[PDB]
Design a protein around this ligand. Structure first.
Ligand SMILES: CCC(CC)O[C@@H]1CC(C(=O)O)=C[C@H](NC(=N)N)[C@H]1NC(C)=O
Ligand SMILES: CCC(CC)O[C@@H]1CC(C(=O)O)=C[C@H](NC(=N)N)[C@H]1NC(C)=O
Ligand SMILES: CCC(CC)O[C@@H]1CC(C(=O)O)=C[C@H](NC(=N)N)[C@H]1NC(C)=O
Ligand SMILES: CCC(CC)O[C@@H]1CC(C(=O)O)=C[C@H](NC(=N)N)[C@H]1NC(C)=O
Ligand SMILES: [Ca+2]
Ligand SMILES: [Ca+2]
Ligand SMILES: [Ca+2]
Ligand SMILES: [Ca+2]
Lengths: 389, 389, 389, 389
């Protein structure tokens, strides 16, 4: 029996905290992995926290130069949601410096991309055993969501990318069944750019809000049917949710094209709620600091910038970073819909801080039927560490 | 099938030790969380120790200022009863600086109150996944039992509080089913004050002995039916079981009103045994040191101060603190009644001791059919630690 | 369905190693409990290593004075056989400075004796939840096997002791069912002395080889029927298996009375093999060093000193100490008999060595159908530790 | 129901990474065992990493002289594939300084050889409980595969060795059922030498590529039927896959006899793919550095040196060492054949490096239907450690 995941995304008014691991504060004395790009995904029985290790530990010399993105030592592991990425509760998942993982109702599927930049291999694991393989088709840093992939009625959908990080690249959709690749598709997006999508299920379709690392300060949107016909564009809303981005005033908005002129970016998410959208963004406009989520009326389909709800999760005095989407299985929450949840990565260390290392901890939040008071569930580590001294 | 928990509380003559974790002594070298407010609760298969972490570890710099009550880093976690609140056996439960948790026969329900003082949110988890939410109704430190909530025939009952910690506040009863809030009630207690109740089941009803942080050195009592009609008052017995409290002589006793004149307090418990009561208190009258339990004949219904049984668990040379109630499931003990058990928190560090940190360890005791010799299962940590030096 | 344990003890020719935990060597850097009196017991699914913690860890200051026998901090915990008594794989069992534990086919029963010397309480746990209680009947250090208790057809049999450690004391037999005490018996042994028995099943009866801490250098033997009628005596064999003991020549032997004249002792074991006996002893005659096991033809029923088999397990350059018996469930080994197994405790530290601490590690051995070459599976820790310096 | 393992070995074009534990890098701060000879084996539910501990930990003084091969403290333990050989996730397996382990569909069988050189005992464990025993038949370091043994239709086959490490020795085949030895055989190989075979299933037969520590730089091959009739020889291919070995040009090749003239060696593997062979070897010809795998057309049956595929896994600037074979159960991968997988041991420390210790980490790779880009999933530890200083 599969976890069908066919329902509609609930309409939520606000977000309550799910979890907070204190990974970095604990790692000051604890045996915690140095890691980046954590994310959450759930099965009918548990929600887990996936992460990319730097094959080393906080407060140790091997944490030096952990600002580096890709390395032979980086592995995908997992723990229970809320737990710290410690050694002693960690499940090995895949060798990976870019990843995605998700459950199909019967078993975990995980994809781990590793290898050399010009010829990376993506190892598909299902049930903790390699089953398939995707080679780099364009020869330039084959990568993936860095968040939950999406499983609907037994098939699992995710988005990859190959090509420049600064100009046109190439993006595809992959679909597997019990670890086996049964489908793929090229996305036609000229003038567009899609990195590190954050996807979820919604009316039996894969909705994804991605990252434009080329020119858009608006987020590319993508809605994938099971037959791998797609709808690609930008988040209509007249509010920019990438970082770096311009003010909210000097911004227009487009359903179709990238707007903004600044390049760069950060991974992020958004949930549709009919015509509206809960969109995620850092508080700072130019730095990875602070985190809030906004509800834009009609923002999914219009260039609207009408805010009816807003909630701060990390204050702008505290570092954040990545954020992504996932959903609670109907088998878990009991609802008749899919409870939208998100996580925020909270980067500490280099390049912003006084360390030889870079790492991050996380907070997870879940959609509820009420408005939630603003606050800051901040990281709370005191830098530098002993290793930095 | 639910864990019905409908029986009568056994009549016990004394208490034998269940467990002792040595959390602080182990934390001198081990990787143990800095924590406060631990408590125990059981399922048909295990008893667990819940606790509030300070998002950091003993002997580490992040343990500084751990005397603080509320923080963004405080989380509810759990281990097996008797185990130390270590990192490597810990289950993440909820983000919380005030909490309660209990099992319904099918799954753990946990409530974790966190957020800002003036608008705290209580996240209801059931089965390790947020399901409901209670916002602060009175805008002043929404809080809860800091001990086991109570489940009877599938519904789970607990008591919250919002308002001043020094004068009249507001208290409610909440009732949920599989994580969903299906009921609540306002408690009318003018001139009264209810903090951190310690509840248990007894003839299909929730019996609670609470804390008066306003003026009573006697403990408010509360007996909750499943329909959320209640009976609120004070522990009749002519003996005061709060701290600070006066002598046993210069005290009268009331079934109805607060007596004593000193304010302040500490969380504590009591079990009814017909008309009598096993009541819990620190040995010192003005400090959180020592621990004994007393059996007052007719003490539940009279202002009696007749002691038939007495048992010292912590001597008055050693620190203690909180104490609370729980019960063994009939599915566990095999009895035809509910075995009354309690735990004592043993606070070490600030404000009483020579540290930058505050933490605590625990001992658990269970009702048996015999008298048990007095002794001191004391904490045993040697302060200050390396971090303090 | 129960684990009937009704078979005969196999006849084995030699012993192969089961396990070795390296607990102390690992504890030089690892987070290992300071412990004493470890022992093994098995269920139809696993064999576990029980031990008494000193509520502290190796290489830590709280390990000071760990030579002390009884303390409020000493707890019974357990791990998998062969694992180290580490914090992070440990199951809490009971508060105990003297203990026994055993499985009935359905659940673990454990007994943990703690409290004050003159009024100790023994807390009976079954399935990790206190169920019964035995108070000190003679008021002088109520204690027990310090090794596996014995379960036959659902009932569990063990031996306790109360009274002097140097003269006549009092010893009883206890029998429980699912944690409940259903029987007990006084053992009439005037001029005799029984400490820390090492028992096993054999033709549906409990065979025990104990310790005489009064005057015998021979080991008291005891064979318990399920109705609690017993046969008490001494190990007939003309060879002394206690420490301190005299030479093998200047010794006679008795089936009935204590021989030897030296007092003191150490816990030890023996298996019957028809009329013969595998008997366990240290190599040294006056110190707790070295370990070998001997097969005495007709030694169970005669004062024989005829050795047909012999096997050294610890050489006399290396420390040992306690040793005890247990059996593999027929459900585990597959045999049509009960495979005799033993463990040796290897004490390190005080009083023999240059430390502030005392601890021990273990080796487990199991009866096989062949002779096994002599060797020394010694402890291997390098003393003193960092803490000692 | 058994795991029949009767299928054919898949024909694979290349190898994708399964796992990488970073055991040594983590052990710079983590609590990781000092170990050697790790290997992988799988059940219908998980793949585990077996290893031989040195009964001590990295960065600790007890890691001194860990270059030693055999010791009383060396034990076989296991973790999940990809996990680090840490203390806190380790399963005790057997006391062993030479080992093999494998699953029969119902339970793990493990063999652990320990004891004195001249009379070693091999303890057979099945289901984590000793069941059988093999004594040294030739009196000179009884040893075994140091990799997965092989189970076909409920019976488990493996190869042992007794005798000189430099000249003729003696080798046997053992076959067991649920831990019980039901068969054995002498291998007639005069002028030959077989150490540390690496075996796998293939058409219901045990195929093994071994190590010649006498004179061959080619690897002895062995194909074992269930009736214990065998076919013994050398890997036909005209390419030498041992280390030390000569150039590929000044080498001939033999299906039958040892070629090469240099002695010494290292454990290694090979898979048949019809008439071809995937053969494993270090990159260096004289040192244990680098690792690649080659596909020789017709290499299994001819003295061919025709390479159609090649893949570098460890570069020749980085240390490697042992490598061995295993297979994914059909119950795991879903294929209609047995997916060939291998692991490479990556030795660090003595004799090559600036330490008092020797240890190693690992990488696991699995056969896929495509060519995989060359790279170096190297160890990555920075030597010397703190302990070395
Ligand atoms: C534009 C996003 C991708 C494209 C190469 O780069 C990721 C950017 C990034 C960041 O902090 O902004 C972190 C990621 N690092 C890892 N996944 N290890 C970058 N991704 C990769 C694959 O290098
Ligand atoms: C009067 C009891 C409550 C009311 C605010 O305060 C708790 C007092 C307390 C103590 O040691 O006395 C500890 C609690 N700390 C935490 N739960 N973190 C106080 N409770 C809160 C919610 O701050
Ligand atoms: C004569 C055996 C008993 C009788 C009091 O003493 C035990 C002796 C002992 C030893 O090393 O010889 C260790 C035990 N320590 C603990 N069990 N903690 C002694 N037993 C007790 C209960 O103190
Ligand atoms: C020739 C292979 C065997 C024969 C005695 O020796 C093993 C060589 C070896 C190495 O690094 O080359 C390591 C092994 N060590 C352990 N298994 N502990 C050697 N094997 C034994 C049993 O000593
Ligand atoms: Ca951008
Ligand atoms: Ca008060
Ligand atoms: Ca004696
Ligand atoms: Ca060779």
């Amino acid at each position: 029996t599969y976890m069908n995941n066919t329902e509609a995304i609930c309409d939520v008014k606000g977000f309550a905290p799910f979890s907070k691991d204190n990974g970095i504060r604990i790692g000051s004395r604890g045996h915690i992995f140095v890691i980046r790009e954590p994310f959450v995904s759930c099965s009918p029985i548990e929600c887990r926290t996936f992460f990319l290790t730097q094959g080393s530990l906080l407060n140790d010399k091997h944490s030096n130069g952990t600002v580096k993105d890709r390395s032979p030592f980086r592995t995908l592991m997992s723990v229970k949601v809320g737990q710290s990425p410690n050694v002693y509760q960690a499940r090995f998942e895949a060798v990976a410096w870019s990843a995605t993982a998700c459950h199909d109702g019967k078993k975990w599927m995980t994809v781990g991309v590793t290898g050399p930049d010009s010829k990376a291999v993506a190892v598909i694991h299902y049930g903790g055993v390699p089953t398939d393989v995707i080679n780099s088709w364009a020869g330039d840093i084959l990568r993936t969501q860095e968040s939950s992939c999406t499983c609907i009625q037994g098939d699992c959908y995710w988005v990859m990318t190959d090509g420049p990080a600064n100009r046109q690249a190439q993006y595809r959709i992959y679909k597997a069944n019990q670890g086996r690749i049964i489908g793929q598709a090229d996305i036609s997006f000229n003038g567009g750019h899609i990195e590190e999508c954050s996807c979820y299920p919604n009316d039996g379709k894969v909705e994804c809000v991605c990252r434009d690392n080329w020119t858009g300060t608006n987020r590319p949107v993508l809605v994938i049917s099971p037959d791998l016909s797609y709808r690609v564009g930008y988040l209509c809303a007249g509010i920019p949710s990438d970082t770096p981005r311009g003010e909210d005033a000097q911004f227009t908005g487009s359903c179709t094209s990238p707007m903004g002129n600044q390049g760069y970016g950060v991974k992020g998410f958004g949930f549709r709620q009919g015509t509206d959208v809960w969109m995620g963004r850092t508080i700072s406009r130019t730095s990875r600091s602070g985190f809030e989520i906004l509800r834009i009326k009609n923002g999914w389909t219009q260039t609207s910038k009408e805010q009816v709800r807003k909630q701060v999760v990390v204050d702008n005095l505290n570092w954040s970073g990545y954020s992504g989407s996932f959903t609670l299985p109907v088998e878990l929450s009991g609802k008749d819909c899919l409870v939208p949840c998100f996580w925020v990565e909270m980067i500490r260390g280099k390049p912003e801080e006084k360390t030889i290392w870079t790492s991050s901890s996380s907070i997870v939040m879940c959609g509820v039927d009420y408005e939630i008071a603003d606050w800051s569930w901040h990281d709370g580590a005191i830098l530098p560490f002993d290793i930095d001294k």
